[PDB]
């Protein structure tokens, strides 16, 4: 009760104070043979997190660590295997028996307790996003079984708060994922979640729409700009895993982008999101068209939409802010690959009118960006920034393989930049091989 609360308080301390375990997931996994009993005392943990002290309280760091540790114990119990990175699969009867029993325990528990955790920590983005990893492990059918409808409502109340309080992409994307989870994994609860969601959305589309109108008609306020971005972010995060086509978001994003080119002064993060949102509208419009049995005009209305958006992305290469360019670029290398001739794979030759081949002028800018923004001259930010430029290239590389840009102009740029490996490589190799 408090004997395990002593052991768990000091386990959080051994994690933080010693750099002997860098990743919580690996620490948990290592103790899991010898200390399963302790690590699945979820009541003990939620207690520590929710109670008020007698003496000695928990510090904001140790609170965070406990939550991260907790989530890893929840995962290891649900999945019944070591975390990704320590893997190697077949269970014994008693192991399989334990898996079910644990899954039941944490579900019943966290259904009750996760809304309370979210409530208490509703403004701590790292913490909130870490807690919202939990419902993916739920035995979701228990929302009927325990007559537990009361706490499904409660989680949904708290998710609605979180999305209303926050703009960080980790938190929002955590909320969206959690909705998808709660939706199409049980009919019993589906209709209930569907409503809280499409209300959540409605309240944000109306807010965004008024903000979009506010911004464009106005000289524009720091608020008019806050309002557009803040709402758009929420909707874009969600638009990835949720089909928001019924609200014509593409139209207003398209205006926002058009204003940013025309008059040249749209704030960078509005432009980036406006793009990403538009792209997700386009993917989802496509998906309904593949799976449906679409007409001549259906295709042609999507075509006009796609060509207007490829145009915007191209023009957005010329935006001063390099984040915009990379987004613009990313979407070009996605879309030119998506609406390539591979769109007539799998007996889908109805889709010919949706195919696009990029023009010379465009291809020359898709080459330009690589010389300008993959291949560049000069802590933690740079190992990260590199993997992105890697991705930008790998995304461009796909276009080159299937001859969607000029493969020869590309490899000429690869020549120009690999020069010193081809002029002095052997020499640098054998030198380094004797030291």
Binding site for ligand K3J (CB under 6 A): 221, 223-224
Task: Using CA atoms of 136, 85, 241, 314 in order, give the dihedral in degrees to the nearest 10.
Answer: 170
- Find the shortest distance in angstroms from Cβ 209 to ligand K3J: 16
Q: Which is nearer to ligand K3J, 141 or 218 (CB)?
A: 218
Q: Which is nearer to ligand K3J, 228 or 324 (CB)?
A: 228
Task: Indicate the angle between helix axes 322-338 and 268-291, nearest 10 degrees.
Answer: 10
- Find the shortest distance in angstroms from Cβ 214 to ligand K3J: 7
- Find the shortest distance in angstroms from Cβ 215 to ligand K3J: 10
Q: Which is nearer to ligand K3J, 149 or 221 (CB)?
A: 221
Q: Which is nearer to ligand K3J, 175 or 232 (CB)?
A: 232
- Find the shortest distance in angstroms from Cβ 224 to ligand K3J: 6
- Find the shortest distance in angstroms from Cβ 234 to ligand K3J: 20
Q: Which is nearer to ligand K3J, 223 or 248 (CB)?
A: 223
- Find the shortest distance in angstroms from Cβ 218 to ligand K3J: 7
Residue whose beta carbon is closest to ligand K3J: 223
Q: Which is nearer to ligand K3J, 221 or 359 (CB)?
A: 221
């Amino acid at each position: 009760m408090s004997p395990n609360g002593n052991l768990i308080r000091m386990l959080v301390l051994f994690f933080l104070e010693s750099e002997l375990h860098e990743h919580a997931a690996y620490l948990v996994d290592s103790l899991w043979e010898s200390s399963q009993e302790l690590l699945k005392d979820w009541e003990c943990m939620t207690e520590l997190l929710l109670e008020e002290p007698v003496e000695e309280a928990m510090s904001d760091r140790q609170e965070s660590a406990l939550i991260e540790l907790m989530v890893c114990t929840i995962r290891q119990a649900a999945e019944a295997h070591p975390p990704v990175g320590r893997g190697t699969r077949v269970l014994t009867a008693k192991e399989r028996k334990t898996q079910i029993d644990d899954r039941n325990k944490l579900t019943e528990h966290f259904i009750i307790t996760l809304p309370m955790l979210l409530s208490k920590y509703s403004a701590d983005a790292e913490k909130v996003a870490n807690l919202l990893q939990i419902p993916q492990y739920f035995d979701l059918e228990i929302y009927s079984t325990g007559r537990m409808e009361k706490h499904l409502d409660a989680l949904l109340k708290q998710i609605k708060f979180v999305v209303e309080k926050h703009v960080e992409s980790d938190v929002l994307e955590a909320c969206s994922k959690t909705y998808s989870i709660l939706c199409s994994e049980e009919y019993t609860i589906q209709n209930r979640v569907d409503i809280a969601r499409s209300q959540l959305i409605d309240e944000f589309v109306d807010r965004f729409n008024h903000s979009v109108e506010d911004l464009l008609q106005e000289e524009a306020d720091d608020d008019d700009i806050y309002n557009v971005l803040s709402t758009l972010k929420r909707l874009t995060s969600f638009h990835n895993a949720h089909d928001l086509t019924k609200w014509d978001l593409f139209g207003n994003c398209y205006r926002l982008l058009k204003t940013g080119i025309e008059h040249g002064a749209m704030p960078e993060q509005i432009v980036v999101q406006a793009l990403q949102c538009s792209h997700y509208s386009i993917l989802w419009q496509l998906v309904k068209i593949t799976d449906g049995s679409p007409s001549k005009e259906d295709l042609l209305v999507l075509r006009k939409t796609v060509k207007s958006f490829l145009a915007v992305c191209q023009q957005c290469l010329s935006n001063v802010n390099t984040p915009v360019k990379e987004q613009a670029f990313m979407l070009l290398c996605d879309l030119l690959m998506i609406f390539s001739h591979q769109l007539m794979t799998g007996g889908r030759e109805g889709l010919q009118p949706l195919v696009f081949n990029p023009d010379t002028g465009l291809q020359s800018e898709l080459l330009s960006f690589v010389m300008d923004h993959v291949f560049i001259d000069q802590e933690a930010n740079k190992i990260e920034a590199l993997h992105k430029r890697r991705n930008l290239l790998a995304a461009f590389s796909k276009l080159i393989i299937y001859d969607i840009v000029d493969m020869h102009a590309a490899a000429d740029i690869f020549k120009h930049y690999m020069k010193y490996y081809n002029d002095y490589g052997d020499i640098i190799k054998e030198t380094l091989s004797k030291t």
